[PDB]
Design a protein around this ligand. Structure first.
Ligand SMILES: Nc1nc2c(ncn2[C@@H]2O[C@H](COP(=O)(O)OP(=O)(O)O)[C@@H](O)[C@H]2O)c(=O)[nH]1
Length: 140
RNA sequence: GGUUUAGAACGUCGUGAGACAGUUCGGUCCCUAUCUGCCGUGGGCGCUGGAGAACUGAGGGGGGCUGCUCCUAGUACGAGA
């Protein structure tokens, strides 16, 4: 039947202030689980999370697009888990994408910058996370 | 090439020879550099015995132009662009 027991699923959300590195960390995760070669960047648009061609050119993630992989914690790189990341955007203009995403995840790794710490958009998505008690960790 | 010479015409003016910041076609542009000047290149003499070399360097001339891309760097700035 199903390929994996439920305890191997981790539905996590990546969300933060603009440019805090959500898409970069998502592409790094995809590479480190091996569904992506060529780690790639965003300012050169070659990243694969970005398709709509606006975020290709303008280099700003505008809408969430879920993605899956197989990374593992028990004897890591082995005994695969199912991490469903959702690369959400952090723009106040697109906070609606965070809203519906934050309401649909069971956890979410918040991203913070080490230069500015929290930022107004992060203080916003913090309300959008307390709004649903979405469990969460921070990634500086 | 044009402007303004001789040929020619149109429009216009003049009765006319002709004329017009009106137009059109055609229409010869000379000079062996003496001096000054400047580019170079020498011959004489000096420089205090003659000669051969190497120099120092007064002083003068040449050369001084820049773009793009990459890195720094998606950094600082900016809520974001
Ligand atoms: N120095 C540094 N720059 C980063 C990091 N993550 C992202 N960036 C830069 O941030 C710019 C855009 O990153 P992006 O993926 O758009 O961040 P996001 O907008 O939050 O997803 C790019 O030029 C990256 O070079 C990081 O961990 N360190």
């Amino acid at each position: 039947a199903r390929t994996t027991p439920i305890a191997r699923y981790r539905n996590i959300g990546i969300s933060a202030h603009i440019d805090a590195g959500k898409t970069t960390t998502t592409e790094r995760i995809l590479f480190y689980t091996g569904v992506n070669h060529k780690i790639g960047e965003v300012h050169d648009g070659a990243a694969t999370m970005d398709w709509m061609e606006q975020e290709q050119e303008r280099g700003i993630t505008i809408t969430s697009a879920a993605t899956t992989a197989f990374w593992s914690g028990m004897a890591k790189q082995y005994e695969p888990h199912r991490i469903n990341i959702i690369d959400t955007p952090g723009h106040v203009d697109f906070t609606i994408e965070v809203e519906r995403s934050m309401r649909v995840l069971d956890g979410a790794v918040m991203v913070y910058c080490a230069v500015g710490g929290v930022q107004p958009q992060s203080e916003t998505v913090w309300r959008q996370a307390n709004k649903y008690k979405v469990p969460r960790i921070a990634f500086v």
